[PDB]
Design a protein around this ligand. Structure first.
Ligand SMILES: Oc1cccc2ccccc12
Length: 220
């Protein structure tokens, strides 16, 4: 199927990304605390539910949360400020807490069931979020005696995510802290604005986009 794109809410950021985040791809967003990466995740979980003319893909969402950063009230706020029904928007985000790295990998394997169920419906899964990709791996695999297994497991986890993205035409969006993925780095700009820098994209030029965080989530 043709690659679909989900608007981030920011015209500047969308332009940097070639139109928005892509289905059949893993977009990996890095940032320190308060960078805006989780705000971006929340915004995407709303935007994807819009029709294409409004920057979405008429899709449902699946969200894997590793350190309790999902905020249903923030979803409701973004939904309402963008004219959507906050209750309907929340209903179409399937939520799962991942308690550890094994569980996180299991949840990705098990997500395929719901993806299959929704595939030929009015609201197929179009966005799968993992926030954060690495918190559990960093917590569990300490030192150099553990690095090899950590990388192996992470590599397998990324492969599972790539497969879901490609097979079912889903945009996978993961957060991280410092191919295979499209890497975007967030930092604080001036006056409370945030800056995104695209790095090492095979077919998009590097560049930067400045954006804001509002009651609409993110926008220019
Ligand atoms: O495997 C999953 C991943 C993300 C969300 C889920 C929600 C319900 C059941 C399973 C889920």
């Amino acid at each position: 199927a043709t690659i679909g794109r989900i608007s981030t809410g920011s015209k500047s950021l969308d332009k940097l990304l070639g139109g928005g985040i892509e289905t059949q791809a893993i977009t990996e967003v890095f940032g320190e605390f308060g960078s805006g990466k989780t705000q971006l995740a929340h915004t995407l979980a709303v935007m994807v539910q819009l029709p294409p003319e409004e920057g979405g893909l008429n899709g449902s969402v699946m969200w894997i949360d590793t350190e309790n950063t999902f905020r249903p009230e923030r979803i409701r706020e973004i939904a309402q400020n963008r004219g959507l029904d906050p209750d309907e928007v929340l209903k179409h985000i399937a939520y799962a807490r991942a308690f550890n790295s094994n569980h996180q990998m299991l949840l990705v394997q098990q997500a395929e069931d719901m993806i299959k169920e929704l595939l030929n419906t009015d609201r197929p899964v179009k966005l799968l979020i993992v926030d954060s990709l690495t918190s559990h791996f960093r917590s569990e695999y300490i030192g150099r005696g553990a690095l090899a297994e950590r990388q192996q497991k992470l590599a397998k986890h990324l492969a599972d995510l790539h497969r879901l993205a490609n097979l079912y035409d889903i945009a996978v969006f993961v957060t991280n802290q410092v191919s295979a993925t499209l890497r975007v780095y967030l930092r604080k700009g001036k006056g409370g604005k945030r800056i995104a820098r695209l790095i090492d994209a095979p077919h998009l030029p590097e560049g930067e986009a400045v954006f804001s965080i509002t009651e609409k989530g993110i926008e220019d």
